[PDB]
Amino acid sequence: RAEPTLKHFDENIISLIESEIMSVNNEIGWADVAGLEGAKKALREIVVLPFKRPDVFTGIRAPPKGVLLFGPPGTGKTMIGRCVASQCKATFFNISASSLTSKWVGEGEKLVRALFSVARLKLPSVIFIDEIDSLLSSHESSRRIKTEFLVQLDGVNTAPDERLLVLGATNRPQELDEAARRRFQKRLYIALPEPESRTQIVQNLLVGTRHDITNHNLERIRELTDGYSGADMRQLCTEAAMGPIRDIGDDIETIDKDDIRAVTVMDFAEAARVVRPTVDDSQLDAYAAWDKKFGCLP
């Protein structure tokens, strides 16, 4: 890297950040996400507008240095992070906590440290940390990678107007002590998609696939998919899409792709019998309870 301020980091490490972790994608808009409108408006207020207008969002309007996305898995918390970053024309730094403590154990400390320095250099910056519950919970390499990470977090709070936010995500927020939670002054519950969002997803996933799903069919798909996460929804569509494939048996080997039957609601009805929602009501009750004590969404 030509950056004079990163000449003291391993070239391999900077090279890593550059090609796997750092991205700039400013054309995602809000991506018409299945993400709830309440969350959407919150991180608009908590992140996007404080990044756009640092002059307005000061005093009590000032953004927190850390935001926690928590809830059931398969809600696409990562893509939300990516949108949020795009929304404020921030440099996106996408990293997984497993990657730090597994894939990249060797020089994990240097990577964490270099990540915050590159972030600091490319302001405004969003650092998205997947499955942050790992990092923040309490073999030996983990200790330093975590320590170094805690050091870096407390280090962002050494400059008021740096448009640098750490966005952590977890499917297991209960695994976070009074001290890990403190690092994240705002904590948004990302809920399972609402009925409207379930169908928007179906529609999204069906493009490029021949289907005869009507506007009325969607009502049905809604009642079929109560309790589904987005991921469950995707699994559903894939299953449904198999319908036209199975009907033709051995003809799949020779059939013209356009002569394959259209996906119908019947396919979804049948597919709903096969797919199973990933999270049970216990997990939901738990999230909801945690959200009551430490959450900030209404």
UniProtKB/Swiss-Prot annotation:
Signal peptide: none annotated. It comes from Caenorhabditis elegans. This is Fidgetin-like protein 1. Changing E131A: Abolishes ATPase activity. Keywords: ATP-binding, Cell cycle, Cell division, Hydrolase, Magnesium, Metal-binding, Mitosis, Nucleotide-binding, Nucleus. Optimum pH is 8.0-8.8. GO terms for cellular component: nucleus. The gene is figl-1. One of its GO terms (biological process) is ATP metabolic process. Its cofactor is Mg(2+). Hexamer.
